[PDB]
Short mmCIF file of C-alpha atoms (C1' of nucleotides) and ligand atoms in Angstrom, two decimals:
data_model
loop_
_atom_site.label_atom_id
_atom_site.label_comp_id
_atom_site.label_asym_id
_atom_site.label_seq_id
_atom_site.Cartn_x
_atom_site.Cartn_y
_atom_site.Cartn_z
CA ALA A 1 1.37 -29.08 -10.97
CA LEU A 2 4.64 -29.85 -12.53
CA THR A 3 3.94 -30.45 -16.45
CA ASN A 4 3.13 -27.98 -18.88
CA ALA A 5 0.57 -30.13 -19.93
CA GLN A 6 -0.93 -30.32 -16.38
CA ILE A 7 -0.60 -26.58 -15.85
CA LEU A 8 -2.59 -26.19 -19.27
CA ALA A 9 -5.07 -28.39 -17.76
CA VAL A 10 -5.50 -26.39 -14.87
CA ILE A 11 -6.00 -23.07 -16.78
CA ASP A 12 -8.59 -24.96 -18.83
CA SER A 13 -10.61 -25.82 -16.03
CA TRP A 14 -10.42 -22.62 -14.10
CA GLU A 15 -11.69 -20.75 -17.24
CA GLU A 16 -14.46 -23.06 -17.98
CA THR A 17 -15.45 -22.72 -14.05
CA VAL A 18 -15.25 -18.93 -14.27
CA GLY A 19 -16.94 -19.05 -17.56
CA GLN A 20 -19.73 -19.76 -15.81
CA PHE A 21 -19.89 -17.23 -13.11
CA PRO A 22 -22.58 -14.51 -13.41
CA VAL A 23 -21.81 -11.73 -16.33
CA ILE A 24 -22.46 -8.19 -14.77
CA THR A 25 -22.05 -5.28 -17.01
CA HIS A 26 -20.29 -2.15 -15.71
CA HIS A 27 -20.43 1.01 -17.35
CA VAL A 28 -17.04 2.73 -16.65
CA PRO A 29 -15.23 6.08 -16.94
CA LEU A 30 -12.30 5.86 -19.70
CA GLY A 31 -11.23 9.34 -19.06
CA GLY A 32 -11.79 12.37 -21.48
CA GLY A 33 -15.16 12.45 -20.55
CA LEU A 34 -15.94 9.17 -22.25
CA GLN A 35 -17.77 6.11 -20.88
CA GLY A 36 -17.21 2.25 -21.93
CA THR A 37 -18.62 -0.90 -20.98
CA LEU A 38 -16.90 -4.03 -19.12
CA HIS A 39 -18.26 -7.44 -18.81
CA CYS A 40 -16.81 -8.87 -15.52
CA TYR A 41 -17.33 -12.55 -14.44
CA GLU A 42 -18.08 -12.46 -10.64
CA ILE A 43 -17.52 -14.83 -8.17
CA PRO A 44 -20.30 -15.49 -5.80
CA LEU A 45 -20.83 -13.52 -2.49
CA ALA A 46 -21.16 -16.67 -0.54
CA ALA A 47 -20.46 -20.48 -0.79
CA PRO A 48 -20.98 -22.61 -2.97
CA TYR A 49 -18.74 -20.20 -5.40
CA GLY A 50 -17.78 -22.76 -8.11
CA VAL A 51 -15.76 -26.10 -8.54
CA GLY A 52 -11.99 -25.54 -6.88
CA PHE A 53 -12.81 -22.56 -5.39
CA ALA A 54 -12.94 -21.27 -1.83
CA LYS A 55 -12.96 -18.17 0.27
CA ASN A 56 -9.81 -17.58 2.53
CA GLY A 57 -10.69 -13.84 3.04
CA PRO A 58 -13.47 -11.32 2.86
CA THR A 59 -12.37 -10.76 -0.68
CA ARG A 60 -9.60 -13.26 -1.32
CA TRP A 61 -10.26 -16.76 -2.87
CA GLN A 62 -8.15 -19.65 -4.01
CA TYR A 63 -8.26 -22.38 -6.71
CA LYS A 64 -7.43 -26.12 -5.62
CA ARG A 65 -6.97 -29.16 -7.89
CA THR A 66 -5.98 -32.61 -6.74
CA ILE A 67 -2.95 -33.82 -9.45
CA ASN A 68 -1.31 -37.08 -8.75
CA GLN A 69 -3.16 -37.47 -5.60
CA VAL A 70 -1.59 -34.11 -4.57
CA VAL A 71 -3.42 -31.42 -3.70
CA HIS A 72 -2.21 -27.73 -5.57
CA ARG A 73 -3.74 -24.49 -4.49
CA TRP A 74 -3.05 -20.95 -6.10
CA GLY A 75 -4.66 -17.63 -5.43
CA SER A 76 -7.80 -17.58 -7.30
CA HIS A 77 -6.74 -14.82 -9.72
CA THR A 78 -3.23 -15.95 -10.49
CA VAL A 79 -4.32 -19.26 -12.56
CA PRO A 80 -4.13 -17.41 -15.75
CA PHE A 81 -0.44 -16.88 -15.52
CA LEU A 82 0.98 -20.24 -14.22
CA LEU A 83 3.13 -20.32 -17.22
CA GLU A 84 4.62 -16.71 -16.94
CA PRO A 85 7.76 -15.87 -14.87
CA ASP A 86 6.71 -15.23 -11.29
CA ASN A 87 8.85 -12.39 -10.69
CA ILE A 88 10.14 -9.11 -12.45
CA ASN A 89 13.12 -7.19 -11.74
CA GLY A 90 13.22 -9.20 -8.40
CA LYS A 91 9.82 -8.12 -7.45
CA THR A 92 6.93 -10.66 -7.19
CA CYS A 93 4.64 -10.57 -9.91
CA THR A 94 0.83 -10.06 -9.03
CA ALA A 95 -2.71 -10.51 -10.45
CA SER A 96 -3.92 -6.98 -11.31
CA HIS A 97 -7.58 -6.01 -12.01
CA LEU A 98 -7.72 -3.73 -15.21
CA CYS A 99 -11.37 -3.43 -13.81
CA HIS A 100 -10.72 -2.60 -10.31
CA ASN A 101 -13.30 -5.05 -9.26
CA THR A 102 -11.86 -7.73 -6.80
CA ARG A 103 -14.71 -10.51 -7.15
CA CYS A 104 -14.34 -10.21 -11.15
CA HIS A 105 -12.07 -13.47 -12.38
CA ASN A 106 -12.46 -12.44 -16.19
CA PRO A 107 -9.03 -13.17 -17.77
CA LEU A 108 -9.33 -10.63 -20.10
CA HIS A 109 -9.50 -7.92 -17.05
CA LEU A 110 -6.53 -9.18 -15.41
CA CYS A 111 -2.68 -8.66 -16.13
CA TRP A 112 0.27 -9.83 -14.25
CA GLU A 113 2.80 -7.04 -12.86
CA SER A 114 4.48 -5.80 -9.88
CA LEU A 115 2.57 -5.11 -6.89
CA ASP A 116 3.53 -1.11 -7.52
CA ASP A 117 2.24 -1.24 -11.14
CA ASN A 118 -0.96 -2.95 -10.00
CA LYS A 119 -1.43 -0.15 -7.26
CA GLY A 120 -0.84 2.52 -9.66
CA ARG A 121 -3.20 1.61 -11.85
CA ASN A 122 -6.03 3.45 -9.15
CA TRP A 123 -4.65 6.62 -9.96
CA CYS A 124 -4.48 6.14 -13.90
CA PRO A 125 -6.29 8.90 -15.98
CA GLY A 126 -7.49 5.96 -18.54
CA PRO A 127 -7.16 4.91 -21.71
CA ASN A 128 -8.84 8.04 -23.15
CA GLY A 129 -7.63 10.39 -20.43
CA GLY A 130 -3.89 9.87 -20.85
CA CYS A 131 -2.99 6.20 -19.99
CA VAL A 132 0.51 5.69 -20.57
CA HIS A 133 0.67 1.83 -19.18
CA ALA A 134 2.28 -0.27 -21.76
CA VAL A 135 -0.41 -3.09 -21.04
CA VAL A 136 -3.24 -0.44 -21.32
CA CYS A 137 -5.93 0.43 -18.64
CA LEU A 138 -9.45 -0.79 -19.42
CA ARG A 139 -10.66 2.24 -17.42
CA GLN A 140 -9.84 5.47 -15.69
CA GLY A 141 -8.57 4.63 -12.12
CA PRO A 142 -11.25 4.94 -9.02
CA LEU A 143 -9.10 7.28 -7.31
CA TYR A 144 -7.86 9.55 -10.11
CA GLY A 145 -8.72 13.02 -9.57
CA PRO A 146 -7.81 16.53 -7.77
CA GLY A 147 -7.58 14.95 -4.27
CA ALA A 148 -8.90 16.23 -1.00
CA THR A 149 -5.61 17.73 0.65
CA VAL A 150 -6.19 19.14 3.63
CA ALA A 151 -3.36 21.48 4.21
CA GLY A 152 -0.72 22.20 1.87
CA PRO A 153 3.16 23.12 2.10
CA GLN A 154 3.98 25.57 4.49
CA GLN A 155 6.50 27.29 6.80
CA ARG A 156 6.35 29.71 9.79
CA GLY A 157 9.66 31.23 9.52
CA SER A 158 12.20 31.92 6.71
CA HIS A 159 14.43 28.66 7.12
CA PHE A 160 13.20 26.58 4.08
CA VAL A 161 13.21 27.13 0.33
CA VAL A 162 11.44 24.80 -2.37
CA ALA B 1 -4.37 20.38 26.40
CA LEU B 2 -1.60 22.23 24.78
CA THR B 3 -2.78 25.83 23.78
CA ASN B 4 -2.59 26.98 20.45
CA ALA B 5 0.31 29.08 21.40
CA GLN B 6 2.26 26.30 23.07
CA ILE B 7 1.47 24.17 19.51
CA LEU B 8 2.92 27.19 17.70
CA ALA B 9 5.83 27.07 19.83
CA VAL B 10 6.55 23.43 18.95
CA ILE B 11 6.32 24.15 15.15
CA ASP B 12 8.80 26.84 15.80
CA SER B 13 11.63 24.80 17.48
CA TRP B 14 10.79 21.99 14.89
CA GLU B 15 11.60 24.33 12.30
CA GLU B 16 14.64 25.89 13.94
CA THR B 17 16.09 22.17 14.44
CA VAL B 18 14.99 21.05 10.55
CA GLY B 19 16.43 24.15 8.97
CA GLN B 20 19.72 23.05 10.26
CA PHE B 21 19.38 19.51 8.59
CA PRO B 22 22.08 19.06 5.48
CA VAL B 23 20.55 20.55 2.76
CA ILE B 24 20.88 18.59 -0.37
CA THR B 25 20.10 19.65 -3.81
CA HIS B 26 18.37 17.22 -6.18
CA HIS B 27 17.61 17.47 -9.93
CA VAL B 28 14.30 15.88 -10.63
CA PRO B 29 11.46 15.15 -13.51
CA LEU B 30 9.04 17.82 -13.82
CA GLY B 31 7.05 16.01 -16.68
CA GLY B 32 6.73 16.97 -20.05
CA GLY B 33 10.28 16.19 -20.46
CA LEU B 34 11.36 18.86 -18.01
CA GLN B 35 14.09 19.04 -15.21
CA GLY B 36 13.86 21.08 -12.04
CA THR B 37 15.40 21.46 -8.72
CA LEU B 38 14.48 20.47 -5.24
CA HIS B 39 16.42 21.14 -2.15
CA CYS B 40 15.69 18.69 0.64
CA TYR B 41 16.57 19.00 4.25
CA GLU B 42 17.61 15.48 5.15
CA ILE B 43 17.91 13.96 8.45
CA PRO B 44 20.76 12.20 9.39
CA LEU B 45 21.39 8.27 8.67
CA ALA B 46 22.47 7.97 12.19
CA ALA B 47 22.07 9.29 15.63
CA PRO B 48 22.40 12.13 16.50
CA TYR B 49 19.51 13.19 14.51
CA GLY B 50 18.98 16.82 15.77
CA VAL B 51 17.11 18.10 19.19
CA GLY B 52 14.22 16.47 19.93
CA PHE B 53 14.52 13.87 16.93
CA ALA B 54 14.75 10.27 17.53
CA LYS B 55 14.45 6.86 15.04
CA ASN B 56 11.55 4.53 15.70
CA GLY B 57 12.08 2.40 12.55
CA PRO B 58 14.33 2.32 9.58
CA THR B 59 12.81 5.00 7.79
CA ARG B 60 10.46 6.35 10.35
CA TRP B 61 11.39 9.29 13.10
CA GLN B 62 9.24 10.93 15.98
CA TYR B 63 9.77 14.61 17.11
CA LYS B 64 9.31 15.04 21.23
CA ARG B 65 9.30 17.82 23.46
CA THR B 66 8.32 18.17 27.34
CA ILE B 67 5.91 20.51 28.29
CA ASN B 68 4.91 21.50 31.79
CA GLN B 69 6.58 18.12 32.76
CA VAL B 70 4.32 16.19 30.16
CA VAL B 71 6.15 14.44 27.29
CA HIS B 72 4.32 14.80 24.25
CA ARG B 73 5.37 13.15 20.78
CA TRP B 74 4.58 13.16 17.05
CA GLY B 75 5.75 11.51 14.00
CA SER B 76 8.52 13.68 12.71
CA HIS B 77 6.90 14.96 9.36
CA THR B 78 3.67 15.58 11.15
CA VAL B 79 4.54 18.50 13.16
CA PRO B 80 3.83 21.08 10.64
CA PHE B 81 0.31 20.27 10.35
CA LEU B 82 -0.69 20.49 14.20
CA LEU B 83 -2.99 23.05 13.62
CA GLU B 84 -4.69 21.60 10.92
CA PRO B 85 -7.73 19.26 10.77
CA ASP B 86 -6.69 15.78 11.04
CA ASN B 87 -9.17 13.79 9.11
CA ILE B 88 -11.07 14.43 6.08
CA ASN B 89 -13.77 12.64 4.31
CA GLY B 90 -13.58 9.99 7.14
CA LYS B 91 -10.07 9.48 6.63
CA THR B 92 -6.76 9.87 8.85
CA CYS B 93 -4.50 12.97 7.36
CA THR B 94 -1.19 11.61 6.57
CA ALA B 95 2.16 13.76 5.99
CA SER B 96 2.60 13.26 2.20
CA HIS B 97 6.45 13.99 0.57
CA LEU B 98 5.81 16.02 -2.26
CA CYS B 99 9.60 15.47 -3.13
CA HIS B 100 9.19 11.55 -2.43
CA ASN B 101 12.30 11.66 -0.26
CA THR B 102 11.73 9.93 3.11
CA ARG B 103 14.65 11.53 4.89
CA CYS B 104 13.58 15.09 3.73
CA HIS B 105 11.52 17.03 6.47
CA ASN B 106 11.55 20.53 4.52
CA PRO B 107 7.89 21.44 5.21
CA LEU B 108 7.89 23.18 1.87
CA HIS B 109 7.99 19.50 0.57
CA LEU B 110 5.24 18.23 2.49
CA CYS B 111 1.44 18.28 2.46
CA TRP B 112 -1.21 16.99 4.52
CA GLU B 113 -3.96 14.53 2.92
CA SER B 114 -5.33 10.89 3.03
CA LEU B 115 -3.01 8.01 2.55
CA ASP B 116 -4.93 7.24 -0.66
CA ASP B 117 -4.05 10.90 -2.03
CA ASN B 118 -0.58 10.56 -0.52
CA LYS B 119 0.22 7.06 -2.24
CA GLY B 120 -1.29 8.29 -5.78
CA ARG B 121 1.60 10.79 -5.91
CA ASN B 122 3.94 8.22 -6.97
CA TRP B 123 2.41 7.69 -10.24
CA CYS B 124 1.75 11.33 -11.00
CA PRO B 125 2.91 12.58 -14.23
CA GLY B 126 4.18 15.98 -12.62
CA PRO B 127 3.41 19.85 -12.54
CA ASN B 128 4.47 19.90 -16.26
CA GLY B 129 3.21 16.71 -17.62
CA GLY B 130 -0.57 17.12 -16.50
CA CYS B 131 -1.14 16.98 -12.71
CA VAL B 132 -4.38 17.52 -11.57
CA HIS B 133 -3.65 17.31 -7.86
CA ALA B 134 -5.30 20.50 -6.20
CA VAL B 135 -2.41 20.82 -4.30
CA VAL B 136 0.06 20.77 -6.95
CA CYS B 137 2.92 18.08 -7.26
CA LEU B 138 6.46 19.30 -7.02
CA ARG B 139 7.77 16.52 -9.61
CA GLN B 140 6.69 13.47 -11.70
CA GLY B 141 6.10 10.70 -9.28
CA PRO B 142 8.99 8.14 -9.32
CA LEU B 143 6.67 5.39 -10.52
CA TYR B 144 5.04 7.26 -13.09
CA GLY B 145 5.68 5.44 -17.06
CA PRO B 146 4.64 2.70 -18.85
CA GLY B 147 5.17 -0.02 -15.94
CA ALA B 148 7.02 -3.43 -16.75
CA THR B 149 3.86 -5.87 -17.11
CA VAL B 150 4.86 -9.09 -17.46
CA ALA B 151 1.48 -10.89 -19.25
CA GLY B 152 -1.34 -8.90 -20.51
CA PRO B 153 -5.11 -10.02 -20.25
CA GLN B 154 -5.43 -13.58 -22.48
CA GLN B 155 -7.61 -16.56 -22.47
CA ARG B 156 -7.11 -20.08 -23.74
CA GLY B 157 -10.93 -20.73 -24.80
CA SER B 158 -13.68 -18.65 -26.04
CA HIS B 159 -15.46 -18.34 -22.72
CA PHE B 160 -15.16 -14.76 -21.86
CA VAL B 161 -15.71 -11.38 -23.64
CA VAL B 162 -14.13 -8.17 -22.33
"C1'" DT C 1 13.71 16.61 30.34
"C1'" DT C 2 16.25 14.51 26.81
"C1'" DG C 3 18.58 10.62 23.49
"C1'" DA C 4 18.34 6.21 21.52
"C1'" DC C 5 17.06 2.51 21.49
"C1'" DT C 6 12.78 -1.24 21.75
"C1'" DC C 7 8.00 -2.79 20.04
"C1'" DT C 8 3.56 -3.18 17.43
"C1'" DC C 9 0.05 -0.96 14.12
"C1'" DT C 10 -2.58 1.15 9.56
"C1'" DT C 11 -3.98 0.96 4.78
"C1'" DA C 12 -5.51 -1.19 0.64
"C1'" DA C 13 -3.63 -3.41 -3.42
"C1'" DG C 14 -2.04 -8.00 -3.22
"C1'" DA C 15 -0.58 -13.46 -0.91
"C1'" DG C 16 0.28 -18.55 1.72
"C1'" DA C 17 -1.07 -22.41 4.56
"C1'" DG C 18 -3.90 -25.51 8.35
"C1'" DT C 19 -8.57 -27.33 10.24
"C1'" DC C 20 -12.08 -29.93 9.83
"C1'" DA C 21 -16.24 -32.75 7.30
"C1'" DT D 1 -11.71 -35.85 -3.37
"C1'" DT D 2 -14.00 -31.62 -2.74
"C1'" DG D 3 -16.18 -28.11 -0.13
"C1'" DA D 4 -16.28 -24.68 3.63
"C1'" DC D 5 -14.08 -22.49 6.91
"C1'" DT D 6 -9.81 -20.75 9.83
"C1'" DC D 7 -5.62 -18.22 10.41
"C1'" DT D 8 -1.09 -15.28 9.33
"C1'" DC D 9 1.94 -12.94 5.73
"C1'" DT D 10 3.85 -9.04 2.10
"C1'" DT D 11 4.73 -4.29 0.39
"C1'" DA D 12 5.31 0.64 0.65
"C1'" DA D 13 3.25 4.98 1.62
"C1'" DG D 14 2.26 5.74 6.59
"C1'" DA D 15 1.65 5.59 12.37
"C1'" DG D 16 1.33 5.31 18.00
"C1'" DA D 17 3.80 4.07 22.36
"C1'" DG D 18 7.48 1.86 26.06
"C1'" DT D 19 12.35 1.54 28.56
"C1'" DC D 20 16.49 3.18 30.35
"C1'" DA D 21 19.91 6.18 32.45
NA1 NA E 1 -5.36 -3.78 -8.85
NA1 NA E 2 3.97 9.64 -0.28
ZN1 ZN E 3 -14.05 -7.58 -14.14
ZN1 ZN E 4 -3.30 3.26 -17.13
ZN1 ZN E 5 12.36 17.17 0.25
ZN1 ZN E 6 0.07 15.38 -8.95
#
DNA sequence: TTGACTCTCTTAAGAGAGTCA
DNA sequence: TTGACTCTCTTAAGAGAGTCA
């Protein structure tokens, strides 16, 4: 809600509830042939999810609180960042999973960045494989690698140059 | 169905027409602080576009040929790949701009791969900066770099560990 | 047969809001 | 007030198909 105090109270109640989500250990590629360990705080697969939480899509949730007799609602991963600018360079800020685990709500696994920055982490080589993200990745992106390209650049005639 | 010879004739007429598009020289980052040059064959901004070409969206075009009284139509960048498999690993193949220039129809700037592989090239460090794509990138991706993250991982209390 | 328009859809990273009990 | 559902939208890499002359 409007006040900084009200917003801090929302963040604090969100952290307390998510802090009681099951903690699931995930071993992850870091790049450079190295492996690390992340501890994700995972929202349940089915109701009930936790005080204030409800599922609006297969892997989408919202957090809601009643403040001054009014319901306030947010995307479930956006709550840590309610005191931050909601845009950057004219692009909407989004909650970005450094752990690439949508059910996870650990704020130590989230950052707040453009949708392009968010998406791009899927292909990052990782913190031990050459990540250049200023807010560093926690793991190699799940889609990093050589790809599976079916056909490369080609021409039948002689009209084109690279 | 169109014979392989009929499809090759379609590819040949497409190449003939695209080869007459304006050829624009672009200097581009290759990664590793190096600069290279790409020559893009750019479809016009407004009609007429070229024989067989029409615009179906702000940056979407189609190629149309009528063979034995049947109208055939393809996405304008898919024509080089009409003799290739159209899926891989259960994923639809898509035309992927190695030059990251949507109006370009140079077939030496296109490859044929899943939408995930396609998107991921936006963040590649490039052929002189560590590209691991088996079909190698022609340039550093336009979105490669440190990013512009507004807020990083953080908690107010002590409920979480990474 | 062809050109120049029209419309909606896919994907996978993300969102907002309404209906009931 | 709180819970458990329902619906559609955004973005930027990509698509298929209809109408008219
Ligand atoms: Na993400
Ligand atoms: Na692309
Ligand atoms: Zn996590
Ligand atoms: Zn990274
Ligand atoms: Zn090009
Ligand atoms: Zn690459």
